[PDB]
Amino acid sequence: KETAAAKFERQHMDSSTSAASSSNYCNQMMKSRNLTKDRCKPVNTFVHESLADVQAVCSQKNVACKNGQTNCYQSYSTMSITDCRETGSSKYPNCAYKTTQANKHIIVACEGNPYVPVHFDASV
Ligand SMILES: Nc1ncnc2c1ncn2[C@@H]1O[C@H](COP(=O)(O)N[C@@H](Cc2ccccc2)C(=O)O)[C@@H](O)[C@H]1O
Numbered sequence: 001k002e003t004a005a006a007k008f009e010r011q012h013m014d015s016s017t018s019a020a021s022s023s024n025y026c027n028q029m030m031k032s033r034n035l036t037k038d039r040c041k042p043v044n045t046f047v048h049e050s051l052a053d054v055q056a057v058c059s060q061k062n063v064a065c066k067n068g069q070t071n072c073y074q075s076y077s078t079m080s081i082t083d084c085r086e087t088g089s090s091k092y093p094n095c096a097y098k099t100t101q102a103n104k105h106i107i108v109a110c111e112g113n114p115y116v117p118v119h120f121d122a123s124v
């Protein structure tokens with residue numbers, strides 16, 4: 001029902017803020033992106049850059065993906081990201097997350113035409 005590209009934007013793009021403002025960011029954002037619907041998604045990263053800047057990573061440093069495919073790309077620049085990780089006491093359907101704001105390089109896998117991110121591989 002959802003393209004891979006659209007799922008990437010839903011799970012990983014938050015161009016509306018420049019950083020997580022509070023320790024409640026992940027709690028709110030995981031819910032509003034439907035990442036707590038059926039189960040609590042344990043770990044998820046949001047990127048606080050323009051979509052154009054993130055899509056441009058598909059023309060930057062080509063690297064292998066964790067799965068061994070070679071359509072992964074590392075951002076040349078660091079980007080503003082938020083890492084969201086469920087707490088050890090979190091239990092569905094009251095999913096709870098720790099927020100960690102950082103500036104890091106992102107690694108995404110790209111596919112399709114237009115050649116855009118379809119997977120978030122890691123931050124470094
Ligand atoms: N080279 C490839 N090209 C095309 N798609 C691929 C490739 N590698 C993995 N995917 C797939 O893209 C989907 C979206 O992933 P995400 O939900 O964005 N990332 C996982 C993290 C992850 C990191 C490494 C490996 C797996 C998971 C996550 O957010 O929890 C996942 O279901 C992957 O199987």
Ligand SMILES: [Cl-]
Pocket residue numbers: 065066067068121
């Ligand atoms: Cl992978």
